[PDB]
């Protein structure tokens, strides 16, 4: 058994992490106080769920998680939340004043004063690990803490844990819910400094989640709680192979092996189906072929883009529920003749498949209906570079006039880091176009 440590940075990372650990407890049958009645080895063990939970002599199952926010009002919600007994205060780290939507303020000014405390609290969890695989890092692209402190933390993690894997869950900015004009700046700054330190990063565009909530859940004005419950379902599907018995994506290294042939191109596109409103008294349960075909519809992707106008490098199908390999192989055959699925020449046109018989768990009272079978597709397609192009264009429009740049220079950052980050992004777009066109 090999442990994984989750790190939640900034408001987005902390509020999504709260939704994930709530869902993890419902999936594994862990009570709000940390008691897991189905766990028979009290105070220890090496089950598959122990990769995410440690155990105390009294039978409390404690998340291997650290929450960091440069301002305390969001983490205070965890300290007094429903699952407050799960965490001990050593795992919850707060500052006094946030990064004010300023990458430079979170990375240089305020990050330097809390980076040593965060690493110490991380080291305390690592010492309880017999075989640490690495880290799962939850953060936003747009905030000052989520962008600035995360990139600082990832550089230090690569130094103190040079052999451990590091995976990202990153919230891509969307104006429909964004709270800062400089979020294109923060996104490109943090992507430039984190790129060489991340092994695999799952981007989630708030625009895609917002519209899925409006379209499929009939929510007129989705809140963060609406978006985070859906995001936790996608994250749960992605991490299920680490917390349950299985053979696909059983360790963090296998994520990079199965999805990332080129190290810089480590942003797999996630697609999830089905998303059904719980307000419907009855809904026709979709078949294996229907949910698998929906994985190639842009309206179900976590980032809006057109994979028809790109090339695949890898593709994984992660099913949960009433699914048997026979129906999967038939759906793939039907889809291959109807869809424009192009792989790169140096890769086999194939699909790695994982099935977990336990159906998806939903939060009681939430917006998502219980389904008998669901699937999350993880495909590394060059079409996700459309999101980099959108981000780089907004960057270019503002940087051409140096708008807001003085806020970053005033925190100690040099104007050359802007252009250096942007040239790295221009090289990233060039890599994508070479592989996919």
């Amino acid at each position: 058994m090999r442990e994984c440590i989750s790190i939640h940075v900034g408001q987005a990372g902390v509020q999504i992490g709260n939704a994930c650990w709530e869902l993890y407890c419902l999936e594994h049958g862990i009570q709000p106080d940390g008691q897991m009645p189905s766990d028979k080895t009290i105070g220890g063990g090496d089950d598959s769920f122990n990769t995410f939970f440690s155990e105390t002599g009294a039978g409390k199952h404690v998340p291997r998680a650290v929450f960091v926010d440069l301002e305390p009002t969001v983490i205070d919600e965890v300290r007094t939340g429903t699952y407050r007994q799960l965490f001990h205060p050593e795992q919850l780290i707060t500052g006094k004043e946030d990064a004010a939507n300023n990458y430079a303020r979170g990375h240089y000014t305020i990050g330097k004063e809390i980076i040593d405390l965060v690493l110490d609290r991380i080291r305390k969890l690592a010492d309880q690990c017999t075989g640490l695989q690495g880290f799962l890092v939850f953060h936003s692209f747009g905030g000052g803490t989520g962008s600035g402190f995360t990139s600082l933390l990832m550089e230090r993690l690569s130094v103190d844990y040079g052999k451990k894997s590091k995976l990202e869950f990153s919230i891509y900015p969307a104006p429909q819910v964004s709270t800062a004009v400089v979020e294109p700046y923060n996104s490109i700054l943090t992507t430039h400094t984190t790129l060489e330190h991340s092994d695999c990063a799952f981007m989630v565009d708030n625009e895609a989640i917002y519209d899925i909530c409006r379209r499929n859940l009939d929510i007129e004005r989705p809140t963060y709680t609406n978006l985070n419950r859906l995001i936790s379902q996608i994250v749960s599907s992605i991490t299920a192979s680490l917390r349950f018995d299985g053979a696909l994506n059983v360790d963090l290294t296998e994520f990079q092996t199965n999805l990332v042939p080129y190290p810089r191109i480590h942003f797999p596109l996630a697609t999830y189906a089905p998303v059904i409103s719980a307000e419907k008294a009855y809904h026709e349960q979709l078949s294996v072929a229907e949910i698998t075909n929906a994985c190639f519809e842009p309206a179900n992707q976590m980032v809006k883009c057109d994979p028809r106008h790109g090339k695949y490098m890898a593709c994984c199908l992660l099913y949960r529920g009433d699914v048997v390999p026979k129906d999967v192989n038939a759906a793939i055959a039907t889809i291959k003749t109807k869809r424009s699925i192009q792989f790169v020449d140096w890769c086999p046109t194939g699909f790695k498949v994982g099935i977990n018989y336990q159906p998806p768990t939903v939060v009681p009272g939430g917006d998502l209906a219980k389904v008998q079978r669901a699937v999350c597709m993880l495909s590394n397609t060059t079409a996700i570079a459309e999101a980099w192009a959108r981000l780089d264009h907004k960057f270019d429009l503002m940087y051409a006039k140096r708008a807001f740049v003085h806020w970053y220079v005033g925190e100690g950052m040099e104007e050359g880091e802007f252009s250096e980050a942007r040239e790295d992004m221009a090289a990233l777009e060039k890599d994508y176009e070479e592989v996919g066109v």
Binding site: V159, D245, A247, K336, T349, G350, F351, E411, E414
Partner: protein, 54 residues
């Protein structure tokens, strides 16, 4: 159309379906960039306090 490496257990199963064959900086360098930025802040604040003293 070939299914390979079918692994099974009690909580599920996994396999691969092939449809067609194929055709870091050190801690010293980090602290030097952090302190060089803090140096630019303190210089900017010093020029402000000099300006305000005038």
């Amino acid at each position: 159309m070939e299914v390979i490496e079918l692994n099974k257990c009690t909580s599920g199963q996994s396999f691969e379906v092939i449809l067609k064959p194929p055709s870091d900086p050190s801690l010293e360098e980090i602290q030097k960039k952090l302190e060089a930025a803090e140096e630019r802040r303190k210089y900017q604040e010093a020029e402000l306090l000099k300006h305000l003293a005038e």
